[PDB]
C-alpha cells in the first residue's frame, strides 16, 4: 500500500498550477478584490466621505482621478463602489451605468447608447431618434437614482464645445434628483481643457494618484501580487509558496532586475509582464522557483528591436544601409534621392579581381524596394504619386551608434566588406 498517494499527488501538482494561472492573469488586467491598497490610505478616506453624501443623502460630488491607466486608476473607484454592496439597503436602490469614452467618438451616438444601460422606458428596441430633451431632472424620489461612471477624458474632450459634459453638470444642480459623476483620466491637467462656461461650473477637486515608492518598500509590491489567499485545497503547499519568494527576494541577481525596470517605468503595469512570463516556463517539471526563470523573461522584453532586424538579411540590403551612412557624414542634414546611391555602387566594383560577384542593374532597385515595406525610410512630408525610380529624396530612420555595434554580432561577415564600413571611403 504505497502506489496510490504518490501517483495521485502528481495529478494534483498538474492541476494546482491551473488554478493559479486563472487568478494571476485575472489580476493584472481584470481588477480582483484580493489586491489591497498600495500607500493610498489617505486618499481612500477622501473618496469614502464623498460617496456617502449622495447614496445616504442627496449631495452629488464630481472629482477627477488622474493616474496611469486601467491597472492603477482602477484600484480605488471600483473598490469604493463595491464597498456599497455590503449594505443591502442602498445597493438595491442604486444602479450603475458603465460608460467608456474610448468607444464614443462624437455626440449624436452618445444620445442613443445611454438608454442601453437604464432600460426604464424602452425594450431591446430604441425609441424615436429625437435627441434627449427631458432626461428626468422635491429632492426625494423613488425612481432609483443611478450614478454614471465615465472614463478617458481625451477623446470627447476635443469635440464641439463638449455638449455632453454640460448635461451631467446640470442634473446635480437642477431641482429633482441630484446625480453625481466619477470618471477616470490619464492626462494631468483637465480643468483648463474646457470652455469658460464649463470651467466656472465645476467642483475644482482632483487628486493626483501617482505612486511614490523606491526600493525597500518596492519589494513588498512584488511579493503581494504573488501572495495567493487561502484557497488551495492543501495548506501545506501554500506555506512553501510564500516562503520561497522570501528566499529569492534577497538575491544579487533578482534585485538587479527589479531596480532596472523601476527606473524606466515605476508604474504597476510595467511589472505585470515580469510576473506572468516566468509562470509560463513553470510547467510539469518545475517544483520550485529560482533566479534563472526570472532573468530570461526580462531580457527578451528589453532587447534593441531596431538592431535585430538586420541579422536576417543578405549582403545587398546590408550594403545599402551603410551606403547612406557614409553619405550622411558629407551631407550635413539634407535630403537626397536614390540615384545618388547608384553612383557609389559601381565605385566599389574596382580594386577587385574579375570574378562572379559583379551584378547587373535591375537588382539595385529590387534590393532597395525591400526596405520600403520595412518602413526604414520616411519622406520629408509628401510622397509624390508621379514619382518614379529616381525622385525620392528620402532619408534614414536609424542612428550613427547602433549601426557600428551590429557588425560583430552579424553572422558571416566578409573581410572585404567589413573594412569598407568602418573606413570613411579613402580608396577607389
Amino acid at each position: 500500500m504505497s502506489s496510490r498517494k504518490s501517483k495521485s499527488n502528481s495529478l494534483i501538482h498538474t492541476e494546482c498550477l491551473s488554478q493559479v494561472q486563472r487568478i494571476l492573469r485575472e489580476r493584472f488586467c481584470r481588477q480582483s478584490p484580493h489586491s489591497n491598497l498600495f500607500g493610498v490610505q489617505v486618499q481612500y478616506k477622501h473618496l469614502s466621505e464623498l460617496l456617502k453624501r449622495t447614496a445616504l443623502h442627496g449631495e452629488s460630488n464630481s472629482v477627477l482621478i488622474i493616474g496611469p491607466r486601467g491597472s492603477g486608476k482602477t484600484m480605488l473607484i471600483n473598490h469604493a463602489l463595491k464597498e456599497l454592496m455590503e449594505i443591502e439597503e442602498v445597493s438595491e436602490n442604486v444602479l450603475q451605468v458603465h460608460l467608456n469614452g474610448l468607444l464614443q467618438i462624437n455626440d449624436k451616438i452618445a444620445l442613443k447608447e445611454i438608454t442601453r444601460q437604464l432600460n426604464l422606458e424602452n425594450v431591446v428596441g430604441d425609441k424615436v431618434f429625437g435627441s434627449f430633451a427631458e432626461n428626468l431632472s422635491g429632492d426625494r424620489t423613488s425612481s432609483c437614482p443611478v450614478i454614471f461612471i465615465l472614463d478617458e477624458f481625451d477623446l470627447f474632450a476635443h469635440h464641439k464645445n463638449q455638449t455632453l459634459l454640460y448635461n451631467l453638470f446640470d442634473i446635480s444642480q437642477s431641482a429633482q434628483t441630484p446625480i453625481a459623476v466619477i470618471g477616470l483620466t490619464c492626462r494631468l491637467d483637465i480643468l483648463e481643457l474646457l470652455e469658460k462656461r464649463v470651467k466656472s461650473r465645476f467642483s475644482h477637486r482632483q487628486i493626483h494618484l501617482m505612486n511614490s515608492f523606491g526600493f525597500p518598500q518596492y519589494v513588498k509590491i512584488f511579493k503581494e501580487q504573488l501572495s495567493l489567499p487561502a484557497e488551495f485545497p492543501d495548506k501545506v503547499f501554500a506555506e512553501k509558496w510564500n516562503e520561497n519568494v522570501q528566499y529569492l527576494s534577497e538575491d544579487r541577481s533578482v534585485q538587479e532586475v527589479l531596480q532596472k525596470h523601476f527606473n524606466i517605468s515605476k508604474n504597476l503595469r510595467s511589472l505585470h509582464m515580469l510576473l506572468m512570463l516566468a509562470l509560463n516556463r513553470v510547467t510539469a517539471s518545475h517544483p520550485f522557483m529560482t533566479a534563472v526563470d526570472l532573468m530570461e523573461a526580462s531580457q527578451l522584453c528589453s532587447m534593441d528591436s531596431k538592431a535585430n532586424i538586420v541579422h536576417g538579411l543578405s549582403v545587398l540590403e546590408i550594403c545599402l544601409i551603410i551606403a547612406m551612412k557614409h553619405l550622411n557624414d558629407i551631407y550635413e542634414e539634407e535630403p537626397f534621392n536614390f540615384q545618388m546611391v547608384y553612383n557609389e555602387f559601381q565605385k566599389f566594383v574596382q580594386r577587385k579581381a574579375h570574378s562572379v560577384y559583379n551584378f547587373e542593374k535591375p537588382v539595385v532597385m529590387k534590393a532597395f524596394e525591400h526596405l520600403q515595406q520595412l518602413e526604414l525610410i520616411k519622406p520629408m512630408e509628401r510622397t509624390s504619386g508621379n514619382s518614379q525610380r529616381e525622385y525620392q529624396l528620402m532619408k534614414l530612420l536609424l542612428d550613427n551608434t547602433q549601426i557600428m555595434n551590429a557588425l560583430q554580432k552579424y553572422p558571416n561577415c566578409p573581410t572585404d566588406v567589413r573594412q569598407w564600413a568602418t573606413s570613411s571611403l579613402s580608396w577607389l
Partner: protein
C-alpha cells in the same frame, strides 16, 4: 507535424512559448499579442497549421480588403455564428455600424456553451494599415478584456515593428514576441525536405547546396 515543424527547423524555442500561453479552455491570456516577423509569409504559414491542429475556435480577417470600419466589424461576426453553437443559426445576418455596439452584440454571441469559458483567438492578418483610418481603433483591442470581459486573445501578424503605431494618448503595453531569423544551418535542411519521389535523399540534397552559396548574397 507535417507542416508545423517540417517547414522551418528553427522553431524549437517558440513551440513551448505559444503552448504555455494556451493551457486549457478556461485559461486566459493578454487581450492583444503583437508578433512581427519578416517576408510576411513565415509567421503566416505556421499560424494556419498550429491552429488547425489543436482544434480551437479561431477566425481569420484582413484589414486591407476593407477600407471602412463598418465592413471590418461585420466579417468577424460572419465567421463566428457558424461556430458559436453546435448548430447553425439559420444563416442570419447582422446589421450594425456603430463601434460602441460591437462590444454589446459580441457578448450575446459568446453566451452559448461553446464560447462560454473557452479561449477565442482573433488573428488580424496584415496589421500595418490600421493607421490610415482613425486613431481610435488601435486601443480598442488593447482594452477589449476590460470591456467585453471575455476570453478573447487578439493576434497580430504584421511586418511593421511595434514602436510605430503609438497613439497620442498612449495605450496598453502588451508582450512583443520576435521570431528568430532564418539560420544558415537550418535553411539548408528545410529546402531539401520536399524531395520528389523520382530521386532520393542524398542524391537530391546535393543539388541544393550548390545553389545556396550563390544565392545567399542575393
Amino acid at each position: 507535424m507535417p507542416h508545423l515543424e517540417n517547414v522551418v527547423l528553427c522553431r524549437e524555442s517558440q513551440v513551448s512559448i505559444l503552448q504555455s500561453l494556451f493551457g486549457e479552455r478556461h485559461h486566459f491570456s493578454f487581450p492583444s499579442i503583437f508578433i512581427y516577423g519578416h517576408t510576411a509569409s513565415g509567421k503566416t504559414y505556421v499560424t494556419q497549421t498550429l491552429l488547425k491542429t489543436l482544434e480551437l475556435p479561431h477566425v481569420f480577417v484582413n484589414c486591407v480588403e476593407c477600407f471602412t470600419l463598418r465592413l471590418l466589424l461585420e466579417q468577424i461576426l460572419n465567421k463566428l455564428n457558424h461556430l458559436s453553437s453546435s448548430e447553425d443559426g439559420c444563416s442570419t445576418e447582422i446589421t450594425c455600424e456603430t463601434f460602441n455596439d460591437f462590444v454589446r452584440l459580441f457578448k450575446q454571441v459568446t453566451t452559448a456553451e461553446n464560447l462560454k469559458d473557452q479561449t477565442v483567438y482573433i488573428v488580424l492578418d496584415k496589421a500595418e494599415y490600421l493607421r490610415d483610418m482613425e486613431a481610435n481603433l488601435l486601443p480598442g483591442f488593447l482594452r477589449l478584456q476590460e470591456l467585453a470581459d471575455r476570453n478573447v486573445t487578439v493576434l497580430f501578424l504584421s511586418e511593421i515593428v511595434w514602436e510605430k503605431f503609438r497613439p497620442n494618448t498612449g495605450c496598453f503595453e502588451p508582450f512583443v514576441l520576435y521570431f528568430p531569423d532564418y539560420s544558415i544551418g537550418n535553411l539548408q535542411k528545410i529546402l531539401s525536405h520536399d524531395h520528389p519521389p523520382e530521386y532520393s535523399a542524398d542524391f537530391y540534397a546535393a543539388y541544393i547546396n550548390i545553389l545556396l552559396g550563390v544565392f545567399y548574397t542575393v
